[PDB]
Design a protein around this ligand. Structure first.
Ligand SMILES: [Zn+2]
Ligand SMILES: [Zn+2]
Ligand SMILES: [Zn+2]
Ligand SMILES: [Zn+2]
Lengths: 572, 572
C-alpha cells in the first residue's frame, strides 16, 4: 500500500506578447519584481499544473486579483550580453533563490513560494530568450517521505477548500484542538498532526513540487514529528488524503525547479516575435495580401510567384525606368537592377518619378535603387553606373569600353527579363543582341512626343528587323525613339504600364491552341497615340537580313565576339 | 585761355559674380585686403575711366599682373547687420580712409592711391549691397588750381608713357637737371618744375580726381612752389600738357570718392544674383525650358501658360491621386490640393506612388502635398483632411459632417479643374453636384481590376446620367468603380495619364467646326481594357432624370441646400 511521494512541476509558463513588449519598453527606457494572479479553479482537464500567466502588467504594482485568485510574487533578471545569459550557473542561480525562499519560509511558511525568470532580449531581431524557474528546495536532501492513501473525507476537503479560497495569501493550513482550520503553527501541528497544502498540480496522486518546500520547513520546525497526515487540497475533485511518515536515506539541500522547454528539455525557451512586432515584416505581409486577396476574389488562376521571382534588369533609369520600376514593384517584383550612366539633373524630378530636388548631381542609377528601398525596404534594388556604347560612333577608350561590354553581359545574364528603356535606336543594338545571344525576354519601350511603342523580342521579329516609323510619316510621329525624352508626360506613364502589364500576361501559361493567358492577350507590339487616344497591336516576323537577330549576325558575334562587336559599333 | 582744373571719377567698378561668390564662401567660413590689376591701355572709347575689375581673386595674395598692368591695393569692409551698413557715416568713413592715404602719401607720394568697398551680403536671398569708394583728398580745401593749355610735346609724352609702363608701381614722375624722367623728389621738382601724372581718365581735358591727391602731397612738400607744369599722361592720345598755378580761395581737407550707382545717384548698389546662384531658381528654370523647348521644336501652337495656371483640386490621394498629381506636375501645374481622409498604410507605398515606408500611419492628404514639395520645392501643394459623405448612408454627427459639406465647397470653388478620384459610386455624388452647381470642369477616373473609365462633366452627360457598367456584364468588368482599388497596377497608371492628358487637350482652344485642338481630340469618355490592350471612346447625352445633373435636382439643391443634400444622402 505504501510508496514514496513523487512530485510534478508546480507551474507552466504562458508569456504573452505584451510581456515581451513591456520588457523591451523597459530596456530602452538589473532585477525586476513581477506579480501574477493564479487561478486554481480555472484548470483545463488537459494541463498538469496551474498556468502562470505573464503579461505587460506582471511588471506592475497594482494588479487586481479576482475573488479566489492567489497573488504570487516573482522576479525577472535581464541580461544585456547574450553570452552572460548562456554562461550563467543555472544551478547556482536556482540555489541562490531557493535559499532566499528558505530564509522567508523559516519565518512564515507561507512565503517560501515564488518564481523567477532569466532572460536576454534581442530587440533588433525581436528574439527573446527566457527560462522560468520555480525554487523548490528539499532539506535535508536525504529525508524522503513514505506515504499511504486514506479514503476521502469530502467533508474535511470542502472545509480546506473554502479556507484557502478565503485566505488567499496562505499555502498551508492545519487543525486546532477543536478541529478547525487555522494558520500553520509549529506547536499546534506538533500535536494535531494534520497539514493541508494548497496544491497547484492536477497530476493524479502527484502533488506540486512545491510540497517539498513546506515539508522542509515542517521538518525544521518540528524535528521530532515523524508521523502526520498530509492533505493535498485541489479546487475540484482530486484532493486526496495521505498517511505520512518521514524516512531518511543516508544539512544538505537539493534544489530543482527549472521549466522544461517546448521541445521537452531542460533549457531556455526562445520566442521570435518579429513576424508580429517588426513593422517592416508586418508591412511586407500586407503588400503580399493585397495581391493574394486580389487573386483570391477576382482571378484565382493568376500566378503570382512567377512574377514575384522574376529578376528584372532595367536599362535606363529615366522617365521610363522610374515608371516601370514602380509598376513592377506593385506586381510583387523584388529583384530590380538599374543601369544608367547619367546623374540626376534639375529638370528630372518633375518628370522621372523616382528623384527629388535634394538628390541632384548625384549618380542617377544608384539613386533609383536607393529610392525603391525607401518605398519598400525589402526590395533587392541595385544601381550600376554603366554606359551602353552606340552604333555609328567612333570607339573611345576601347579598354574601358570593352569592360563596359563585358559588364553589360554579366548583367543581361544574371537576370530573367530585360527592359530596354533607352533614348535612341543607337543604344538599343548592343543590348538587344546580347540579350538574344543569352536567351532573355526583351521588352522595348520607345517614346515619341505624341505616341509610344512597346514590344517584345523572340519566330517573332525584333526592334531592328523592320523599321518602326516610315519617312513619309507624320512630323509628330517620326519623333518616336528619336532621342525624344521630353514628350507629353502622359506618354511615358502609358508606355511604362503597358510594358509591365505585357510582361505579366506574357509570364503566364498560354492556353493550348490560342495566344492568350489568364491575364489576356500577349501582343508582339503595342502602339498608342495620344492625339486621338488609340492603340494598335501589330505583329511582325523575324526579318532575314536584320542587323541584329539575323542568323548571319548571331554567327558573327558567336565566332568573333568583341572584334565583331567593335567593328559593328564604328561602322557608319 | 585760363580755367580751373575740373576732375572726373578715377575708376568704374565691375564686380563679377565670382567676386560675390568668394565673398560668401568667406562669410560662412571684418576687413579684407583686395588687389586688382589695372590696364590703362585697354580702354573702350565708350568709358570715362579705367575699369576696376573685381573677381574671386582680388581677395587673393598672388594675382598675376600682365606686362604694363598697374597693381592697386584695396580693401572691403563687410557688415553682418544690414542696419549697420545703412547707418554708417559714409562721410566719416571715406574721411577716415583719405587720412590713411594722406599718411602714406607724405611718406611716398606713390602710395596715396587706393579703393575701398563697404558691403552687406544677404546670403539667403542672394542679394548683395556694396559701395565702391576711391579716397580723393584735397588739402587745403581752399587751394584750387588755375590752368592753361600748352601745345603737345608728343616727344615728352612718349617719354613718360614708356616710363610709366615700366615703373608699374609709380603714379608720379618728374624731370631731373638733365631732363630725364625720374621718381618724384621734392627738392628736385622744386627746381625742375614739372610733374607728370599717370591719369586714369579718358574724359577729354579732365584728369582723374586722383590728381587732387598728388597735388595735395605736392603742396605739402613744396609750400613755395606755386607755378609749375602739369602733364596728364594717358596710354593713347589724350595726354595733355598744362601750365599750372596754385590759387587759394578763403589745414582743411575735403574728401570725395564714392561711386555713383547704376541709376546715377550717390548711393549703394544692390545686385540680386538669385536667378544665377539659387539652385532652387536654376532648377525651376530648367523645368520651364523642358516645356518651352518641347513646344518650340515640336508644337509651337501649344499653350503652356493655360495649363500652368490651372489650379487643380484632387479628391483622393490614393493610387490615382499620386499618379495624377505626378503627371500634372510634369505639365507645369503649380497649384495642387489633395483631399483625403485616410492615413498612409503599410500596403500603400508600393502602390500609391507618393509615399514611403517611413511615413506610415501619418495623415495621408497632408503627406502627399509634402511629397510633391520634395520633388519640386516651388509647388504650391496642400493637403486637407476632409471626408466626403456617401449616398445611402445614415448621417453621423450631422454637425461636423455639415462643416465637411461646407469646406468641400470652398475647395471646389477656389479651384479650376476638379479631379474625382474616389473608390465607389457613392463618393462621387456630392462632389459631382457641387462641382456642377459651381461651374467647374470635372474629370472622373474609375478603376476596375481589368479596365478603367475616364470622363468629363459638362449638353454632355455626367457620371450619374446613365450607368457605366451593365449587370449582364463580365465578372472582371463589373468590378469598375466598385470600391476596387487593388487591381492590376497598370490600370491606375493608364487611367491617370489619360485623365491628365484629356485635361490638357481639353484646356486648349477648339478649332471652329471640329471637336479637336492642337493636342488632339477631346473625348467625353475613354475606356481601356488590359486583357486585350484596347481603348474605346464613347459619348453620352445628359439624361433628363439623372439624380445628379438633372434640372429638377439642381433646382432642389438651389432652393433648399443642405436640407436637400442631407435627405439625399440618407435616402436608400
Ligand atoms: Zn507556537
Ligand atoms: Zn531583327
Ligand atoms: Zn630731396
Ligand atoms: Zn447626369
Amino acid at each position: 500500500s505504501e510508496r514514496v511521494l513523487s512530485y510534478a512541476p508546480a507551474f507552466k509558463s504562458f508569456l504573452d506578447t505584451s510581456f515581451f513588449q513591456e520588457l523591451s519598453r523597459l530596456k530602452l527606457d538589473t532585477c525586476q519584481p513581477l506579480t501574477v494572479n493564479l487561478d486554481l479553479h480555472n484548470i483545463p482537464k488537459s494541463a498538469d499544473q496551474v498556468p502562470l500567466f505573464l503579461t505587460n502588467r506582471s511588471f506592475e504594482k497594482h494588479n487586481n486579483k479576482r475573488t479566489n485568485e492567489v497573488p504570487l510574487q516573482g522576479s525577472i533578471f535581464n541580461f544585456n550580453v547574450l553570452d552572460e545569459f548562456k554562461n550563467l550557473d543555472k544551478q547556482l542561480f536556482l540555489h541562490q533563490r531557493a535559499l532566499e525562499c528558505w530564509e522567508d519560509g523559516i519565518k512564515d511558511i507561507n512565503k517560501c513560494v515564488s518564481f523567477v525568470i532569466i532572460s536576454f532580449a534581442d530587440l533588433k531581431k525581436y528574439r527573446f530568450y527566457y527560462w522560468l524557474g520555480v525554487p523548490c528546495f528539499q532539506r535535508p536532501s536525504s529525508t524522503v517521505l513514505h506515504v499511504r492513501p486514506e479514503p476521502s473525507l469530502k467533508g474535511l476537503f470542502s472545509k480546506c477548500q473554502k479556507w484557502f479560497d478565503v485566505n488567499y495569501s496562505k499555502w498551508v493550513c492545519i487543525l486546532d484542538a477543536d478541529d478547525e482550520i487555522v494558520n500553520y503553527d509549529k506547536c499546534i501541528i506538533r500535536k494535531t498532526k494534520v497539514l493541508a497544502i494548497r496544491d497547484t498540480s492536477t497530476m493524479e496522486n502527484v502533488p506540486s513540487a512545491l510540497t517539498k518546500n513546506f515539508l522542509s520547513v515542517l521538518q525544521y520546525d518540528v524535528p521530532d514529528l515523524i508521523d502526520f497526515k498530509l492533505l493535498i487540497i485541489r479546487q475540484n475533485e482530486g484532493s486526496f488524503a495521505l498517511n505520512a511518515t518521514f524516512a531518511s536515506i543516508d544539512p544538505d539541500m537539493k534544489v530543482s525547479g527549472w521549466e522544461r522547454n517546448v521541445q521537452g528539455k531542460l533549457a531556455p525557451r526562445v520566442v521570435d516575435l518579429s513576424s508580429l512586432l517588426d513593422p517592416l515584416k508586418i508591412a511586407d505581409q500586407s503588400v503580399d495580401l493585397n495581391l493574394k486577396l486580389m487573386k483570391w476574389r477576382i482571378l484565382p488562376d493568376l500566378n503570382l510567384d512567377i512574377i514575384k521571382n522574376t529578376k528584372v534588369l532595367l536599362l535606363g533609369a529615366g522617365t521610363l525606368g522610374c515608371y516601370v520600376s514602380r509598376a513592377l514593384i506593385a506586381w510583387g517584383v523584388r529583384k530590380i537592377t538599374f543601369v544608367d550612366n547619367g546623374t540626376v539633373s534639375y529638370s528630372n524630378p518633375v518628370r522621372q518619378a523616382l528623384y527629388n530636388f535634394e538628390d541632384c548631381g548625384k549618380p542617377k542609377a544608384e539613386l533609383a535603387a536607393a529610392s525603391l528601398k525607401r518605398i519598400f525596404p525589402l526590395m533587392d534594388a541595385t544601381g550600376v553606373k554603366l554606359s551602353i556604347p552606340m552604333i555609328g560612333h567612333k570607339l573611345v577608350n576601347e579598354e574601358a569600353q570593352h569592360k563596359d561590354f563585358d559588364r553589360l553581359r554579366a548583367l543581361i545574364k544574371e537576370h530573367d527579363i530585360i527592359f530596354l528603356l533607352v533614348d535612341s535606336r543607337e543604344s538599343r543594338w548592343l543590348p538587344s543582341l546580347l540579350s538574344n545571344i543569352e536567351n532573355k525576354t526583351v521588352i522595348n519601350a520607345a517614346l515619341g512626343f505624341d505616341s509610344y511603342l512597346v514590344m517584345r523580342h523572340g519566330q517573332l521579329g525584333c526592334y531592328f528587323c523592320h523599321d518602326v516609323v516610315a519617312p513619309t510619316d507624320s512630323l509628330t510621329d517620326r519623333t518616336l525613339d528619336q532621342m525624344c525624352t521630353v514628350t507629353r508626360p502622359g506618354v511615358a506613364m502609358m508606355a511604362s504600364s503597358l510594358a509591365v502589364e505585357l510582361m505579366t500576361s506574357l509570364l503566364q501559361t498560354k492556353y493550348s491552341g490560342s495566344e492568350t493567358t489568364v491575364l489576356g492577350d500577349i501582343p508582339h507590339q503595342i502602339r498608342g497615340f495620344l492625339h486621338n487616344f488609340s492603340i494598335l497591336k501589330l505583329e511582325t516576323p523575324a526579318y532575314e537580313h536584320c542587323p541584329a537577330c539575323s542568323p548571319k549576325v548571331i554567327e558573327a558575334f558567336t565566332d568573333l565576339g568583341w572584334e565583331f562587336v567593335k567593328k559593328a559599333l564604328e561602322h557608319p
